[PDB]
Symmetry: D2
Subunit: 330 residues, 4 copies
Amino acid sequence: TIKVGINGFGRIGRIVFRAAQKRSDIEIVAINDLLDADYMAYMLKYDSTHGRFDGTVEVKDGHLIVNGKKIRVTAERDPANLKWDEVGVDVVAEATGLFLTDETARKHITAGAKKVVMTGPSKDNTPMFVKGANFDKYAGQDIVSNASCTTNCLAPLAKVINDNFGIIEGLMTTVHATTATQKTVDGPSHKDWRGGRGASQNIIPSSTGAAKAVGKVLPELNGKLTGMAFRVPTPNVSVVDLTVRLEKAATYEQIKAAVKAAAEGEMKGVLGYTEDDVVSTDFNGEVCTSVFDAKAGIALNDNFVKLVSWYDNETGYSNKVLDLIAHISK
Amino acid sequence: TIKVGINGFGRIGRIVFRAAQKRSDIEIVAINDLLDADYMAYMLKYDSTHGRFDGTVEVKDGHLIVNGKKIRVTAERDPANLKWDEVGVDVVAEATGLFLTDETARKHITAGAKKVVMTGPSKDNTPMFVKGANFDKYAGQDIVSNASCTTNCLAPLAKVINDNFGIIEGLMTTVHATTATQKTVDGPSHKDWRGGRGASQNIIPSSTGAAKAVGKVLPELNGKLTGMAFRVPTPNVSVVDLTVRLEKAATYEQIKAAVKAAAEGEMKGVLGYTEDDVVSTDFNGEVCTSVFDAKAGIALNDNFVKLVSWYDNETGYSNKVLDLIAHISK
Amino acid sequence: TIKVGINGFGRIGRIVFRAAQKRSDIEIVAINDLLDADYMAYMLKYDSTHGRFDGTVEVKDGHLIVNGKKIRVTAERDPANLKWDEVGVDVVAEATGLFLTDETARKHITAGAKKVVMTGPSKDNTPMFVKGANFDKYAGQDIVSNASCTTNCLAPLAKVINDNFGIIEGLMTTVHATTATQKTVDGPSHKDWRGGRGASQNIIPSSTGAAKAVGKVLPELNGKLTGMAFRVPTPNVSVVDLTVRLEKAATYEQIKAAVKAAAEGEMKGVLGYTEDDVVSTDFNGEVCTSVFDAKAGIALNDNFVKLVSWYDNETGYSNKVLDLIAHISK
Amino acid sequence: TIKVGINGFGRIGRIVFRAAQKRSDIEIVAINDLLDADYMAYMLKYDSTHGRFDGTVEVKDGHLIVNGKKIRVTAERDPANLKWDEVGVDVVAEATGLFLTDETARKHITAGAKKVVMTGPSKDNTPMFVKGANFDKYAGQDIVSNASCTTNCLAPLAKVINDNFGIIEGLMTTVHATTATQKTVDGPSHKDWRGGRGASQNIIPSSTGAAKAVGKVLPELNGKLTGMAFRVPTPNVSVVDLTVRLEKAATYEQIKAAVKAAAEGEMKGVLGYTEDDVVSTDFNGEVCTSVFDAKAGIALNDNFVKLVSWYDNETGYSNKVLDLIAHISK
Ligand SMILES: OC[C@H]1O[C@H](O[C@H]2O[C@H](CO)[C@@H](O)[C@H](O)[C@H]2O)[C@H](O)[C@@H](O)[C@@H]1O
Ligand SMILES: OC[C@H]1O[C@H](O[C@H]2O[C@H](CO)[C@@H](O)[C@H](O)[C@H]2O)[C@H](O)[C@@H](O)[C@@H]1O
Ligand SMILES: OC[C@H]1O[C@H](O[C@H]2O[C@H](CO)[C@@H](O)[C@H](O)[C@H]2O)[C@H](O)[C@@H](O)[C@@H]1O
Ligand SMILES: OC[C@H]1O[C@H](O[C@H]2O[C@H](CO)[C@@H](O)[C@H](O)[C@H]2O)[C@H](O)[C@@H](O)[C@@H]1O
Ligand SMILES: O=P(O)(O)OC[C@H](O)CO
Ligand SMILES: O=P(O)(O)OC[C@H](O)CO
Ligand code: NA
Ligand code: NA
Ligand code: NA
Ligand code: NA
């Protein structure tokens, strides 16, 4: 069993926590945030998106007892003082959004943890991994990043399309659920003016490096992909809309067959495949990081196609954070 | 003054009515729908999207008095019985969605009107005209179609891009506001299963012929564009996301300059241009049918680019219905 | 096992179906609606509010196979032709909204069923039963009504409050989720003008007979309660806000104790009790028809108090439809 | 002309600014916030709720030029250093939410301003005023409060009902639009746990002292009113739902006549009256602080009634902030 400490009990920290409950190989043993234990219990117990917690939650002497297991609660803002070794933490899920460089995340190792997984793209050269794309490149590094939710959706699909047909170039849009960085009514967002506008009222364009970042996890695609996002008023689940030019001519039935074969074979549990008349809520709670929507896509011709793939930006990414923790512990 | 009769007082009929109040050349003299006059007055007076009617509305003897002018109200299910000649109607804005062929719309001419403008794409070979694409091709037809709200956004932008740089092949997506065909909660939609899913909860993939329809108004683009839609939980305003491969190399700054020149020149009032940090609500009430969003788009390279253009799917289209009524009346 | 036929596969029919899967005493053996079996299977499999169906669904020879059991599918518009006897149906869940009188619902009995439960308030004097109010008054009737979702929330709470403290007079408000009768954007609703206004954009006042209907199930409260509704932009879960004047003085802590005792005692599984910091989504999927929110209510004084109670208007009501089917089948 | 400085360019500061443009008696001459001038120009120019600014906005040398008038922009967090006398400020609209006591707001006077109006209820004994209730009690104080949006809706209506019929006791609910203190998805709100839950997904109960505060502006009602709130997923406009017991029996027609007479007489421009089939968006942009909805209310009997009154929580309150500035300057 790998013992995990969570730093940051936001959306990702809390959904990582829930996902860990259903996995025998990983045990959460500690959570650090600036929240009292009783408030943390409340945030875990009730979830507007994913419903009530499946289990028991007790607060006792400032710590959490979840399904009978003691969880150490701390409130340190300097990771160096977290004493992770005192709870035997193997890997830290670094989920605050604040320690996305080697120098900041290394404090967890100073504090006693063996390894760190950043639940977001690194701001320095800390290596990023995406399951289905490059987990097999992991080379023992003590600090790694799971990239972003959007890159976790695009890269598996781009890998299948490229391996089979050769991507000449592609442009991506993600139509993305509202997230915690947005505002309920027009409010201050000085580093992202569009992102301050009322989330429930608007389609909001947003820049994203997620498509370009596919080149870090699939170097053969470096320079061949970029894109952008529209934030829309849904609370969870997002969709990738990938427009690509192909070297090898492929009918839409041939593209479907290639994606389905990968979903049922090497990318099982990462890439999914459906031909049903799905909508976004049909993926609320989905663990696959990329579910190809066969009927939604459209080809102009055998070398120019628009492909659609769903992702639960909360659940799929959180599950693959856990997958990366397990992988680096092998 | 062109005297206009409106058949159908749905979203388009009512926003056409409001827009006509601000035009000196066009006067609404009659409305036909299966609604009592007092209910018609209520729907005109109050609008959840566009606010209160700017003017006075009263009911007198079963007809409407709007800004002191009498509007004849009827409830005929057969357009042949509309007696448009009794109110001197020149052009009918045919806005029921039910009479999109020559044989059905021509009943208005039997009923006394001189010309008909369909407020939707024709279902036979009734010619479509889109301002900024092919109004200059109009050659005296007495029944025409103003195409669709999406075709009105894509066509003007595609023409500028094709005329300057040559579109080899393009794929659209329209991220589109919720419309009246959708359902509040998951409900029956036997001919469009995804479309019956609750509109406020979901991102809903939808098919659209708008991109392919650009070939009807711009024959040079026939076979070069196709696309799809995502319906999202906003009440009005939509956006075109056009991914094109270009024959002539063009940097993103050169593309911006070409679009801005058309917006400030020949296409003024049809194609708009902005470099501001806009979001969808910034176009609620916008009259331009295609507003290019300079900062939102992104180029992968000089021959492969993603272009973004906004449209108020209610207001822009309705204003151009009136423009086509004026154009065919010259 | 009670064999049940469902007439009407709308929101209530489909959530009754799901809830029946978890009950050993009731088995759905047939569904009737104007939908093809493959579309029925789609609506059952995917739900924007309640997630994916927990089980298997397939179509075989025009009928449904759900969890390996065959469900007879028909599309009869006249219930007299439903041949319920051919599938051994004991009770019909009459869920179309169209047959809310004895003469119409009794066609099911001519068609071979033994008893009928209307999933809405009867429009004649067909008796209504509400769990926690008057199930014990049932005296062998073969056609009954389960009242409405709001009456199911208010009645159990009103009974506890009246029995303990005496309600002299009370006024409700239900802040209610959007329903299928509403419109996505401002549209025609000739018999309820406010109800045609776009559901996602507005707080919509609505009339309701639910408070007055409590007198039918609790004759002692006849003439003592009335109220109204506000429809708001949420997809499911509603709340009762009951303002009552009391005959016997009761502090808010004494009121809480009385409600908690009923929730933990005689009214267990019908009336719930919480002191947590809950919000509407915390009751999405809740089976209790009335969950008292201790912290949300407020007393002005010992004889004048505002009480708050939650209900999943889909799930709670549907589960109590099944409870009434079981109760009349004893 | 009264020269005004705005401290805090949030929703209230910006809508006060817009409202001031349409009033000759008040001139905004300076704005202080922690935002650059170019970002302030953007927030003023575009508004998701109220549309584009009606006028011209230029940034020049770090200050704003709005409709040709120079507006001094500063970014001081210590009001004592604002040098309001250097721009000749008469009254400060204190709109940060941070200086709601005499000691903090007095810094504006230290800094050169003559008077301060707090755009929120005071936290100390700073006197509150509500137009239509107690402006005539203002006695020259240099620091005052305009109370809250909800008290500005309830107090005018409560005054008419009490003056005519005698309020024995009342309980209020406000069904309230989402505001800036809420969260887009479940997030941290340690002082208001329910208020951190995703705003677009939930009906959210909230405590409010607004009803009790009516007793400060109408002492004759002290101890006779209290209530609570439900926050719901709309972006603006809220509604008061007042359940009251009356000393003098009054038919609902008599209540309507009393409210209408006050709306057309002494409370003109504060209290409005409608019998139309309105919904919340019909009051987006409304300047009256309380619009009585005659058809929405319901009486149980001649002494126990539920009354409904609308308010644009942004626009009405902002206009009455300006009214209070003008009043204290008389
Ligand atoms: O931070 C100052 C800049 O604000 C805007 O730019 C930011 O926000 C944009 C979205 O509205 C992003 O696209 C951009 O990356 C951010 O820098 C504004 O557009 C700029 O003019 C300001 O310099
Ligand atoms: O009408 C029966 C068919 O329903 C679906 O197809 C419709 O709905 C789709 C959106 O869900 C549209 O894309 C499609 O064009 C419609 O025909 C279902 O997908 C089909 O299998 C049914 O035969
Ligand atoms: O059907 C005609 C009437 O429409 C309205 O009244 C209906 O709609 C209201 C909600 O907007 C309901 O309260 C009312 O009970 C319905 O009858 C309108 O208010 C009436 O004046 C019309 O006659
Ligand atoms: O701040 C700690 C308390 O948090 C909650 O109470 C706050 O938030 C409530 C709404 O969820 C408010 O009603 C209350 O006024 C606030 O104090 C929690 O309910 C309490 O148990 C905590 O002590
Ligand atoms: O591009 P067209 O043919 O619609 O022409 C519209 C121009 O405004 C003509 O002046
Ligand atoms: O209050 P009633 O009559 O519905 O009784 C329901 C109780 O659960 C009976 O045991
Ligand atoms: Na585990
Ligand atoms: Na006109
Ligand atoms: Na069963
Ligand atoms: Na002014």
